[PDB]
Design a protein around this ligand. Sequence first.
Ligand SMILES: Oc1cc(O)cc(O)c1
Length: 500
Amino acid sequence: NQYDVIIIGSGIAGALTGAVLAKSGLNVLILDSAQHPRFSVGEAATPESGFLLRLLSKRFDIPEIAYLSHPDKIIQHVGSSACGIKLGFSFAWHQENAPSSPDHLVAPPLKVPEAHLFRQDIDYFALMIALKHGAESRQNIKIESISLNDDGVEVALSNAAPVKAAFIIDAAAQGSPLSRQLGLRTTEGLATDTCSFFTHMLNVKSYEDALAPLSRTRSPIELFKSTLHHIFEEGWLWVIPFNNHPQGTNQLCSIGFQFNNAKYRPTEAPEIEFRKLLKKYPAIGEHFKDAVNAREWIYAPRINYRSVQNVGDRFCLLPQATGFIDPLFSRGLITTFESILRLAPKVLDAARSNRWQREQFIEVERHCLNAVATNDQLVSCSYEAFSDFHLWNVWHRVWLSGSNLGSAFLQKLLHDLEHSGDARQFDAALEAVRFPGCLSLDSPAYESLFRQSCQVMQQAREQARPVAETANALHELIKEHEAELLPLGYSRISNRFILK
Ligand SMILES: Oc1cc(O)cc(O)c1
């Protein structure tokens, strides 16, 4: 065995995984069929992924990882093109055959700013961290075959000798090449069935210029400085600027749109489908009067999948290779960084004791498969809440209250790790959470609210209930549980901009 671990994929997941393991004294080999620089999506950072990056940084003593958690540190250390800013998520509702109202808006702001990750620059910087810590990288290779045995892993490569290792990690946000070989990938059982078109554009107007200024919306933040979601019956469109930072030099804006395939199936080329969508929703079209594509539109007819298994004796699929649901709420990155945090110490224990059995990595699988299941519920119920604004206003508080509890929990673990400096206590605290993969992590009150809310949403879809009743049902449930949530005034429905 030439190496200890082989990592497929050299984007942010595999790069950070290689960084922490190489730092810890393993001989890592990162493999990739693509080569840097390259384009990538999964751009919206969240407070959770912010804390999880700072946790990775502190747990393994790699300060450069912490730089990726804050837009000012990104600009300073990665580069001035490497991110835009975000002061919150924001959602603006629309319907076919009616003018869009700037009062049909929700946008809960952040205290601490976050990044819109320009992934080509962030991913390359991440690989840099890995390379500087001893990990070998090989780009632009083709994997003929992967063989899993009792004594190791062997990877065959085109125009090169095969490479042997103790363990293999699949960190490809790609078509899960190892999961496709193992036959673990499936669409069966997913509530979500969504397609996606996405690209980067130039000369995209801000929300303030194109639809409605700050004086009309009454928002505490510019929507230009937010992860903007345009939502409507059959799906949603994102507007994620990289050109909204005062110190930034990036001119592009990420643009993507998703359809619920149960409601609408696209039939034509992306650019035709794009012009049809803007005719249907003319207010959304005001963003793109002067706009130009800076790259080819990528179409993906089915973005949703899950896996029945993701760990074995001598392999592990990281969440991005295990399953994906939807870019909505940007749960992809959260699941990924948390999985690396759980997996890394166990792979070290395995390598330091030469024990490679499925049993050891079983809590990595539990977290990952739950996170994809919870993310499926969240998104599918959210796609149903798109049908009316008032319903969306009440529903988004379910996501928000959970997300806040998740964040506060990760602050607690970060604060306790910073104080005590005890890596063993942290690993155990993380594994001992009552609801791994779920939004709150360790709150029985919230997971009660989430479960019953999703039951109300899925019942409302099945029986086609009136939106005013469903909204009230959820409003009651929020009032019932509000004492156990944080004191942010979630039940006050007239407040559409929930402060901290
Ligand atoms: O995007 C987010 C906004 C907010 O106010 C809280 C949170 O956890 C996420």
